[PDB]
Every structure is written in structure tokens, then in C-alpha cells.
Amino acid sequence: RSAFQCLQKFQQHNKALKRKEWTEEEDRMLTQLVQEMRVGSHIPYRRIVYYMEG
DNA sequence: CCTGCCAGGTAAGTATCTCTGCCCCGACACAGCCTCATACGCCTCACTCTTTACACACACGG
């Protein structure tokens, strides 16, 4: 199996890929982003994720 | 060492085509005009099942 598949099978079961635990600064950043890219309702969560980490 | 007539069987006959050279040809190019007919080709449009993404919801379980 190529390195690609090994990394895939590791990531798909890597728990450190996502943080899983919320912190206050994460919340502050999320609120700021939502307010920046607000449209009313239905905030684009993808374009928000792509400004956050984990 | 030859030679032949007669009975039986058979048989007629009538009645009721594939090449092969060879002269005397059509159809090729190609010229402008010209009108309508025929063919091709290519991109834009349609659509249709089948996923593809993504915000949101809702048990679920102990």
C-alpha cells in the first residue's frame, strides 16, 4: 500500500485530526466569523471552517 | 475339327458452357454563372439517473 493509502487509513481513524473539545477563544472566533459572513440565516459553515483549525 | 437351326429372351412398335481479347466508348480536370437540392458537422441544448454537497434535525442510550 502506497504512503497515500496508509495516511488515509490513519487520518480516517486519527482522533487528533479534530479537537473535539471547545474553548472560549474558539467560540469568540466562531462568533466573529459568523457575524462577518452573515447573510441573515443560513451562515455558510464551510467558508467558516476554512478560517478555523481543527 | 469345324458348322448351323430352333427355342427363349429381349426389345421395338403399333393400337386404344466458359472464358476471351477487343475496338469504340464514358468519365475523369476544370471555368465562370446560378438555383435549388443534399450532406456533413459541430456546438449548444436537454435531461436524467445518480450521486454530491451541506445546513439541519433527531433520536439514542445508559
Write the CA distances from A30 to A6, A9, A14, A21, A41, integer angstroms: 33, 30, 24, 14, 15
Dihedral sign from CA coordinates of A8, A9, A10, A11: positive
- In this complex, the nucleotide whose C1' atom is nearest to the CA atom of residue A44 is B55
**Ordered alpha helix ranges (H), chain A:** 3-11, 24-36, 45-49
Alpha-carbon distance A26 to A53, whole Å?
A: 9
A44 Cβ contacts chain B strand, under 7 Å: yes
- Give the bases of strand B that a protein CB approaches within 7 Å: 53-56
Among the listed residues A31, A35, A12, A14, the one whose alpha carbon sits nearest the alpha carbon of residue A22: A31
What is the residue whose three cell numbers read 466562531? A30
